[PDB]
């Protein structure tokens, strides 16, 4: 029954470890996302100051 118990559990272990791997993936993308979605607000804010300057 030794290689019956080990096997059910090894299948679980590779599926478990892959779920953990998915979360780290998510976590790396969110940190990239931060810079992308911050970069998009800064360049809209820039031409907004310029608009009220060019009126001035």
């Amino acid at each position: 029954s030794q290689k019956n118990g080990i096997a059910t559990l090894l299948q679980a272990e590779k599926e478990a470890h892959e779920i953990v791997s998915k979360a780290r993936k998510y976590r790396q993308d969110k940190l990239k996302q931060a810079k992308t979605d911050a970069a998009k607000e800064i360049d809209s804010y820039k031409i907004q100051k310029d608009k009220e300057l060019k009126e001035f």
Partner: protein, 224 residues
Amino acid sequence: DLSVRSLHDIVKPEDFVLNSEHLTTVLVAVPKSLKSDFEKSYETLSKNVVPASASVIAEDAEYVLFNVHLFKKNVQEFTTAAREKKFIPREFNYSEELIDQLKKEHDSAASLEQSLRVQLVRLAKTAYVDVFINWFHIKALRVYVESVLRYGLPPHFNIKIIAVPPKNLSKCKSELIDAFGFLGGNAFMKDKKGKINKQDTSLHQYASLVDTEYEPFVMYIINL
């Protein structure tokens, strides 16, 4: 014998699991009486103990060596629980580098003793001859210089090496003393025999650096 021993030549991918980090393997060194006791207990030692893992991978006279697989957090509970039952855990994981280095230690140690022994037997034999040629060089020198000190002139001496058959040395030594002894002393002469080595006294050591008993003519005794 298990008390420091961790196995590394009986590895297998399923009797020794560690490939992620969830599962690990703890080995338990169990006395023979206690073998049944382990087969019954193994599951209860901690929670999450893998089913039917308890098998004797190796066995010796005093001890039977088991593998059990379980979850890593649970290894602390497992080990303490094992020691109450009066087993002795032996900790070995299936990290790749561990298995390899212990195996290496056996091999590297056999190769060091092996090479060395061949050079060492050879080195002594080669040393033996050289120190033999050198021992006789001093004696020849020693005897020559001494002869000059005791007889004076002529500087041309009649010199021999006499092979004595084993256990006739004492009888040989005496005969030489009677004949030739008068030359180096007609009163500084007594009968003597054989060679006795000591640190009780310094007498009877036949030497020109410590006080000894004066021989009536130059004679040195070589024992092989």
